[PDB]
Write a protein that binds this ligand. Structure first.
Ligand SMILES: CCCCCCCCCCCCC/C=C/[C@H](O)[C@H](N)CO
Lengths: 48, 206, 225
């Protein structure tokens, strides 16, 4: 969860609405195992 | 004390963020009473109710954000043994004491009435004799003060005795022209340091 | 230039007036021949302003008891001093059992003799005297009627002081006592601002709300001296 701590303070002449980009990754201790199929590819028809 | 004290390092000592105080031009400032703020919050507050003896150090941190078009100054000071006075109706012939709501504001805090005397009858210009830090919105928007345990006794009851107060006083009123953002928050986060509890007992609220 | 004068040793050490006690012959109070005075040093303003520089203070006290008739003259009258620790019997009369001086210290002096001097050690159970106590001495809830306990340090009440004239019959001469104290072997901590407002009550630092005295004088213009 991300929370507003103080406020968004802006001078006069600058936009009052900003956008925040979020990035995500792993670390050196990240480990996976037990390969399997995913849900992200589907065939409802042949590939022409 | 002949008892062997507990040292819950991780569940006790951590940064505790409090509510934000909206600044206004006529704002007189606020004050908190330690360690009465954290008595209702987290593991620190629960073990304080089950233990009669209390000793810890504190970490004071204040947050006030502003832009380059904002000009203001805040005075964050630590006054040990801060006692609240009373105007006595203004005449001076009446004997009255402040209630438990003002002397024990709790987590939300309380607001000053006459910041010149700090309701102690003492000048505000002499407040810098005690440890203090200035927050100037053109340079430093934050403040950090490390206050150790100061008392005539090694251990003391956390519920009744308040060690020191915290004063955030807008000495120089913040000025901004029309069109600028008028909402300026003041965030105060605090943390205990080196806490020792003793005299495990029943549940005692106040 | 030596700094010995501005040190806390010479500034805290000298005599000052902490108490005024009278035993008039006619009146509604002390005319019974004895006086029971609970010990409070804050009824006096100027030495109070000196002790409020610092929060915690540890020291020893030397006392001086001056006796004279309210008009200033003297009579050959013998007086009795006694110190009553907390829990010790307080005298109900001049012939009372408490003045019999069994285990309680006592001082005998006349009005023609020089003032009496005694030395009082540090009797507080804590490490130092606490002038400003933030909290309550009592547990449980505190209502508006129980708010009197605020600003009260239980370690600051060290006993009660009492005086009487010797003998069973009433003494025809009035007596006025002036108690003095010299602070020595002093240790200090936690400086505090000096109070700029007039005193009101002994137990708590109340200030008059209608008029707030400015700590500095005022002038007509900032650019003109
Ligand atoms: C033989 C008679 C000796 C009489 C001894 C009387 C003891 C008086 C000691 C005074 C030393 C300071 C005690 C406390 C001072 C202030 O009143 C306290 N802070 C009260 O709050």
């Amino acid at each position: 969860t991300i929370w507003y701590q103080t406020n968004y303070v802006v001078p006069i002449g600058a936009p009052t609405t900003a956008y925040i980009v979020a990035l995500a990754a792993a670390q050196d201790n990240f480990t996976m195992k037990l390969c399997k199929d995913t849900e992200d590819i589907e065939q409802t028809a042949n590939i022409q | 004390a002949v008892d062997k004290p507990t040292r819950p390092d991780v569940s006790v000592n951590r940064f505790f963020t409090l509510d934000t105080k909206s600044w206004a031009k006529d704002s007189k400032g606020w004050y908190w009473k330690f360690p009465d703020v954290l008595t209702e919050v987290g593991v620190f507050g629960q073990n304080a109710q089950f233990h009669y003896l209390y000793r810890s150090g504190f970490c004071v941190h204040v947050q006030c954000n502003a832009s380059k078009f904002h000009q203001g100054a805040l005075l964050v000071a630590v006054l040990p043994e801060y006692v609240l006075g009373t105007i006595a109706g203004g005449t001076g012939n009446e004997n009255s004491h402040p209630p438990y709501a003002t002397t024990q504001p709790g987590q939300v805090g309380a607001v000053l009435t006459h910041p010149y005397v700090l309701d102690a009858g003492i000048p505000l210009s002499q407040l810098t004799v005690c440890p203090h830090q200035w927050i100037n919105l053109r340079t430093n928007n934050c403040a950090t003060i490390i206050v150790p345990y100061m008392n005539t006794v090694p251990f003391d009851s956390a519920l009744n005795h308040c060690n020191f107060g915290l004063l955030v006083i807008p000495v120089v009123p913040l000025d901004f022209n029309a069109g600028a953002t008028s909402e300026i928050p003041i965030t105060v986060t605090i943390a205990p340091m080196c806490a020792e509890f003793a005299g495990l007992r029943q549940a005692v609220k106040q | 230039h030596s700094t010995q004068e501005t040190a806390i040793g010479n500034f805290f050490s000298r005599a000052g007036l902490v108490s005024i006690i009278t035993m008039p012959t006619m009146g509604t109070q002390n005319t019974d021949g004895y006086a029971n005075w609970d010990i409070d040093l804050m009824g006096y303003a100027q030495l109070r302003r000196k002790c409020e520089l610092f929060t915690y203070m540890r020291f020893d006290a030397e006392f001086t008891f001056v006796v004279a008739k309210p008009n200033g003259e003297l009579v050959p009258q013998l007086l009795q001093y006694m110190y009553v620790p907390p829990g010790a019997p307080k005298p109900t009369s001049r012939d009372s059992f408490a003045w019999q001086t069994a285990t309680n210290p006592s001082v005998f002096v006349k009005m023609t003799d020089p003032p009496a001097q005694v030395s009082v050690p540090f009797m507080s159970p804590a490490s130092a005297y606490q002038w400003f106590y933030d909290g309550y001495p009592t547990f449980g809830e505190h209502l508006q009627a129980n708010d009197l306990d605020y600003g009260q340090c239980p370690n600051n009440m060290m006993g009660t002081f009492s005086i009487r004239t010797v003998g069973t019959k009433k003494s025809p001469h009035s007596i006025t006592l002036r108690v003095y104290m010299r602070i020595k072997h002093v240790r200090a901590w936690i400086p505090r601002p000096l109070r700029n407002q007039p005193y009101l009550f002994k137990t708590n630092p109340n200030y008059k709300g209608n008029d707030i005295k400015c700590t500095s004088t005022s002038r007509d213009k900032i650019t003109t001296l």
